[PDB]
Backbone:
């Protein structure tokens, strides 16, 4: 058929799904950022969820 | 004996003036993580520098206010000021003034010249004037500190987050290395991007120096 | 031994026949890594026999699947034993229970 | 009954505790199930198959 | 733009195998950095002594027995694998054991040597069950670090895998301090459980020395 044969599953899918979920009143809510690098810095520092 | 492997091969790639990749080989089992995590933590949370802290605009009175004559909003102006790199030579606090009249871009080059204040990238865009008659004036506080102090914790003036450290991004990876008849060794790769105030290699030097200094009463 | 079990381990370990089970009661006289000697109680003797039970154990013998069969004692000098008591463990046995 | 035994042993009655990553020292975000289990080794050895 | 420097402020001893060390003061974030680095270094790099070779007068291999001895030769080697020794003036030593009579044979029966001391004399080695039985052996002890199986390096020599590491468990904690008149200073407490063959303060000094010598490379460019 015309479908791709390489496809992630299992732990990759669960990790990407958890990574992109959304909560309410988590730590760091309401900030305005300059870009993705600021988000990475804030998350790896420990100042944001 | 008490001798451990010391690396012999050091490789540096300069992607940009503010972008570096460093490779070190060979290490002993487990030492790549040990060095990389400590270096990353120090470079991320314990580096000193100068940054903008507080701003004041005569026309505006609140973060949600709207001023006629400017295409952008107050939030965008604060966001642009948040990423303005600068150096201070021999002081700790300083106030800067910006005035411009006309229609067109408003750029960091327009900042009034000072003696102990140096601009890193002059072609930095702060504002835009749609109308010829409109004009904007402001004052800027620049201080000294460490790490990253958000404005929320600090709690007609506006406060913005302060980025004292010159590090924009830092990351590392560990791979396999095989000295002859010993195929379980470490190879360390480090990726760094700074804000242009200092060179990334120079920052790595400061990080290593600080770490080696803080443990000095225990080394026998 | 397993920390969580069902209670059927002793029955399998004993009915397998890989351990050494005392025939008559008494007391342990000589213990060693290859031999066990039991002195029989008076009530279980016979008029014309000495009253000594001798057990020889299997040491490092290959099985049908090229694994190891070995027995080791689990009784100390001078201890008393009743009949039907485990005297030594075979492979995959721990104090008379099946241990895989 | 399992929870009563756990409470007698001075352990949480959920079976989950907090763990830390041994490479960085950082804490995992959710509590993890930790315990004891019986495991076996089978007669399928890579030394006999390569 | 200056940092205060930590110092050793306490060494609390609980027993011969359990110790606590306190470092004070630390700046923000340095407690976890130093704690994790030291925990990783301590668990893999400390040197120590171990048994590597065994001789017994009548034995030819470990899949056999001895008349009068309760245990197998293999069980005897397994028991010998867990003996703790402090060696002062060398990296090699050969100890001798002779015993007769019914009863336990422990580490207290090993011949006394001036430069060698045994930290657990009650360590049980084997048993004798016959009054006419006797045992006589020679034990070779060396120094090193890490885990060296006998597989990766005369009929009668028996080899045993050597575990040289004297450390068994490391934990650490970070707490608020009350140094001077500030309110942003911390203290780091390290708890170690060992085999009684290494002094804790020397271990901390050696770990710090290893880390500094490793860091000397990044200072240059």
Residues:
């Amino acid at each position: 058929n015309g479908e791709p044969i390489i496809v992630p599953s299992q732990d990759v899918v669960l990790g990407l799904y958890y990574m992109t979920r959304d909560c309410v009143n988590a730590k760091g809510e309401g900030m305005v950022l300059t870009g993705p690098k600021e988000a990475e810095r804030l998350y790896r520092s420990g100042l944001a969820s | 004996v008490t001798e451990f492997l010391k690396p012999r091969l050091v490789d540096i790639e300069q992607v940009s003036s503010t972008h570096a990749k460093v490779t070190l080989e060979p290490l002993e089992r487990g030492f790549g993580h040990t060095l990389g995590n400590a270096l990353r933590r120090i470079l991320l949370s314990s580096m000193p520098g100068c940054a903008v802290t507080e701003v004041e605009i005569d026309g505006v009175l609140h973060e949600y206010s709207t001023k006629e004559g400017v295409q952008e909003d107050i939030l965008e102006i604060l966001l642009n000021l948040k990423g303005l790199a600068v150096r201070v030579q021999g002081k700790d606090e300083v106030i800067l003034t910006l005035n411009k009249s006309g229609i067109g871009p408003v750029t960091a080059a327009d900042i009034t010249h000072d003696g102990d204040v140096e601009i890193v990238k002059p072609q930095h865009v702060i504002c835009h004037l749609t109308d010829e008659n409109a004009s904007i004036s402001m004052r800027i506080k620049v201080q000294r500190g460490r790490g990253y102090v958000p404005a929320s914790t600090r709690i007609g003036r506006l406060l913005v987050d302060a980025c004292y450290s010159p590090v924009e991004r830092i990351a590392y990876n560990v791979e396999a290395a095989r000295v002859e008849q010993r195929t379980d060794l470490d190879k360390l790769v480090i990726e760094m991007e700074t804000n242009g105030t200092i060179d990334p290699e120079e920052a790595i030097r400061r990080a290593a120096t600080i770490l080696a200094e803080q443990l000095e009463a225990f080394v026998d | 031994k397993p920390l969580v079990g069902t209670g059927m381990e002793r029955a399998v370990a004993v009915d397998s026949g890989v351990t050494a089970v005392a025939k008559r009661g008494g007391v342990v006289q000589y213990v060693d890594a290859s031999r066990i000697v039991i002195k029989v109680n008076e009530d279980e003797m016979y008029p014309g026999e000495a009253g000594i039970d001798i057990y020889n154990l299997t040491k490092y013998t290959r099985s049908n699947q090229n694994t190891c069969i070995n027995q080791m004692p689990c009784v100390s000098l001078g201890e008393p034993v009743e009949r039907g008591d485990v005297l030594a463990d075979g492979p995959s046995t721990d104090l008379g229970e099946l241990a895989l | 009954e399992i929870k009563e035994l756990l409470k007698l042993g001075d352990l949480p009655t959920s079976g989950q505790i907090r763990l830390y990553d041994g490479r960085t020292g950082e804490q995992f975000e959710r509590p993890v199930t930790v315990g004891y289990m019986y495991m076996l080794k089978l007669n399928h050895l890579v030394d006999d198959k390569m």
Remarks:
- Residues 41 and 62 of chain C are 36 Å apart (CA to CA).
- Residues 18-92 of chain C form a domain with the OB fold (Dihydrolipoamide Acetyltransferase, E2P) fold (CATH 2.40.50.100).
